[PDB]
Structures are given as C-alpha cells and as structure tokens.
Design a binder for this molecule. Structure first.
Ligand SMILES: CN(O)C(=O)CC[C@H](C[C@H](N)C(=O)O)C(=O)O
Ligand SMILES: CN(O)C(=O)CC[C@H](C[C@H](N)C(=O)O)C(=O)O
Ligand SMILES: [Li+]
Ligand SMILES: [Li+]
Lengths: 263, 263
C-alpha cells in the first residue's frame, strides 16, 4: 500500500526528549527538542520516511508482567503494534531482544554510581560493604532489573540490601533520585546509567559526581517490532551516523557544549 | 536434515586465537587458545551446537574489491558459504552489515594511538599537525578503511599524510606495527584498535602506551551469512554472556590477569 507516516514512540527524559519552553506556540514534532529528537530527524532523513513523535502512554521503557505476561512501556507499544519504532535511551537486553528488533547500539553506557561531592565511596564494592550511605535505584527499568537478576556476588548483595533497606531506597523518577542525592548530605548514592550520570554532573548546582568504574557495559538501540521491514534501513542509518562522527557530535551538543559546570 | 558440525572461521591474532605451544600433541579445536576460542566454547554451549575452528585462508577480515566486486577475508567466507560463523575481532561496519549478519557487539573498541613511551603526542590532532613523528596503519582492515573514507577534517588530513609519506608508514601485520613503534626511537606512532593497544601495553618489554582518547567508537560482532538461522541464537548468547559478566571476565583473563608489566 501507500506509504504511511511512521509512528515513533519515545519518552520525556532530559536531555533525550524535552518539550521546548515555547511548545504552546508550536505544533507536531517541533514541540520537542533533545538528543533523541535530533537523532530521529537524522534517521528519518537517511531512511526517507515521514514520522510523528508520540510519548509512551505509561511512561515505562519495557518489561513483561510475570502474571499477565503483558509487555509495558515502549517495548509494549512495539509488541502490540501501537508504534512503528522506538527512538529513546532504550537499553538492549536479552529479554527485550527476544520480543522486538534492535539496531546496533547508538550510544554506550553502563550502570554507574552518582554521589554528592565529598561522599567517601569509590566503587560498588565500597557501597556493598556498608549501610551508613544508603543507595538505590529507580523502581522500574533495566538498572533495577540488572540488580534483581544478578548472580554476581557484589550485585546480588546490593540487591538484597536494597530490598530490605529502610526507609525505602527506591525512587520513581530520575529527578527524584538526583534530588535525593543532592538533599541527603552525602548519605544517599543513586545507581543509574552512566549517560544520565554524566549529563547531571554538568548541570547546576554542580554538586554531583560519577564515581568508580561502571558496573556493566551495554548499549541503547533503536527498536522496531520483530520482523519489521523498517529495521534494516534504520540499523544501516545508525551505523552510518556513527561512522560519520554525528552520534558523537550529538552527545557533545546535549551533554557538554552547554554544560553549566565550567570547561 | 540432520545437524551438521558448524564451521567457524577465525584468524590467528593474539590474544584472540593462538596455536598452543604444545599444539603438535593435540588435535582439532584443542590446538588453539585465546579469548575467541573461549568465547566460541561459550557460544556453542549456549546454542547447543558442535563446531570446528578453521583459520581464514587469506588472512583478511573482510573487504570488497572495487573492480571484481569479490569479498575477501572472513566476510568472504561467510558470503560465499565456506563458513557458517565468524568468531573473531571483526569490526561491525556499515558496508559489512549490508552483506552479512552481525550479533550485537561482544567487545567495544575505538581506533587509538600507540606510542613508544616518552613520545610527545597526546592526540590525533597532535599527530596531524606534524611530520617528525611518522604515523600509519595496517595496509588492510577497518582502521585503514576508516581513514581512507573519512570526511572528518583531522582524519582526512591524516589519510592524505599517510598516502604521501616516505618511507611508507604502512605495515603488514600487528607485530610489524608494534616492532616499528619499539624500534623507531619515538619517531613512529601506530594507529590500531584500542583492544590491541591495551593488550600490547601489558606485554614485555613494557615500552608502549595508549595515548589520548579514541578516534571513534564501535564494536566487534559475531558474524553469520545473511539470513542464517544461527544468527538469532548466537546473538541471544552474546547478550546473555554479557549480562552474566562473562565477557568482562574473559577480557580480564586474556589482557590483564597475566599482564607482564606489573599490577
Ligand atoms: C537514560 N534513561 O533511560 C534513564 O535514566 C531512565 C532509567 C533507565 C531506563 C533504561 N535505559 C531502560 O531501557 O530500561 C534505567 O533503568 O536506568
Ligand atoms: C584486533 N585485530 O582485529 C587487529 O588488531 C587486526 C586489524 C584490525 C581488523 C579490524 N578489527 C577489522 O575487522 O577489519 C584493524 O583494522 O585495526
Ligand atoms: Li530482538
Ligand atoms: Li548485516
């Protein structure tokens, strides 16, 4: 049949996708800005399609409920045919790869530790061996699921600590995790993806830092429904943009070029 | 039909695949050791196949001749049906992705600079702005092709320099590049993948170092013929091994655990 506008699902998460300050004076895709908005434009230009940016209804990335077997988040929107492509900081994981297609990664990351400056922690092992400095994750997403599933001794110990710690060490949003680090006088550390950690380190009031090595190594990928014809072209576009240096240019644009914490 | 032994193509390159010192007393897959030998065993165990390690006949990774349009190297062995899978430090590139299937990356790398300790170079830009310290690449492979194709100003300038430099700055093997760095009294820098650079930095006589940031960011993938049914299982195996921490364990084993240059 005739070409149709491609429905893109994404999520509001700075600096990936944000509503522009003047969004009420704008329409359609022009309401949004950020790394993933720019990436979507480049992918569409290379693949030759028109598209519509939509925001995932349930605000989730993608997991399958053990009881109902239903996929939520952006993964669910692809699985159930509500969107054609997801362009977002969506981690490539085994269980997601079983149900949707992913491009090769467009950005690398690992789980990492965010501390308030001056907190005496240098590694995951350091955290795991103590309780005075509380630590936790989001209550949803691949970072939480990493800990919940891990059989690596240090990480399994961290998960057991997080489940049993009081008061709750879990947060609902990135903003809440960052605020908790900033307001807890060195007594809370937040486990999050290194990409986000690096972004926040360059935001005022410049009081956080990423410490130690990353806990794992993985990537974000562009996702499509399993078997979608769109997958091949989008993957080739990611590879081309990477080779051209354009993915690095976009990370620099949104993370560092207008960093607020000096040069 | 009945299951058949899977033909794996790979290449002799330390520390990925090496003939064991006592190889003449051994047979079959047991003749070989290294990171990729261990990785092959893990992939086969997860996917449930038997396999035979074979060494690529022409000693190349994979490129298409502009005149004959024939693919060489491990990519060629897959394209022409001489092997079922390639398990090697084979860089995922756009032009290769067009003709074979790749897993998600099992190892990250970027092009990097190897110097003899004490050489006054800290970046690609530094190299590009001078000629007293000669610099070059292998005469075959993705690093060479990166420079040949780049439209990034610094890298295009480096390529023009390399093509016109005398005596020739190209080398035929990794061993020749490393020897040239070691023997040139600080007057040769070798451009190579960061993985290899990091390996050599931990080998006696401990006189090289990796300097500056990487020039690009990419990955090695397990390759199969386009459309091969084996691709799905192998990709899921890579993702599982990564999540379990086993890829990092294997890199540590072959790069650092028996490093020769201290702790
Ligand atoms: C960058 N961004 O995505 C965030 O920080 C949000 C929380 C991520 C989601 C994760 N990428 C997923 O795909 O599940 C996490 O689980 O850490
Ligand atoms: C690790 N190993 O692979 C080497 O050092 C050999 C040379 C690599 C080959 C490259 N991975 C390819 O896939 O073409 C290079 O072009 O730098
Ligand atoms: Li998939
Ligand atoms: Li491919």
């Amino acid at each position: 049949g005739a070409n149709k506008t491609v429905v893109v699902t994404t999520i509001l998460e700075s600096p990936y996708v944000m509503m522009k300050k003047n969004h009420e004076m704008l329409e359609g895709n022009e309401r949004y800005e950020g790394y993933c908005v720019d990436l979507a434009a480049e992918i569409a230009k290379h693949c030759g399609f028109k598209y519509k940016l939509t925001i995932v209804g349930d605000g989730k990335y993608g997991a399958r409920d053990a009881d109902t077997k239903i996929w939520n988040g952006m993964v669910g929107e692809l699985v159930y045919g509500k969107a054609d492509i997801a362009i977002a900081p969506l981690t490539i994981t085994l269980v997601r790869e079983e149900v949707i297609d992913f491009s090769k990664p467009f950005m690398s990351l690992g789980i990492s530790i965010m501390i308030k400056k001056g907190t005496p922690i240098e590694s995951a092992e350091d955290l795991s061996k103590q309780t005075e400095i509380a630590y936790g994750t989001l209550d949803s997403g691949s970072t939480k699921e990493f800990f919940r599933r891990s059989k690596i001794a240090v990480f399994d110990k961290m998960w057991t600590y997080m489940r049993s710690a009081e008061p709750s060490v879990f947060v609902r949003t990135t903003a809440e995790g960052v605020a908790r680090v900033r307001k807890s006088k060195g007594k809370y550390a937040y486990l999050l993806e290194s990409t986000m950690n690096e972004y926040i380190e360059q935001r005022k009031p410049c009081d956080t830092m990423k410490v130690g090595g990353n806990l794992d190594s993985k990537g974000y990928g562009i996702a499509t429904p399993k078997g979608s014809s769109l997958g091949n072209a989008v993957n080739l576009a990611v590879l081309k943009l990477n080779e051209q240096g354009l993915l690095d240019k976009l990370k620099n644009k949104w993370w560092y070029d207008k960093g607020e914490c000096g040069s």
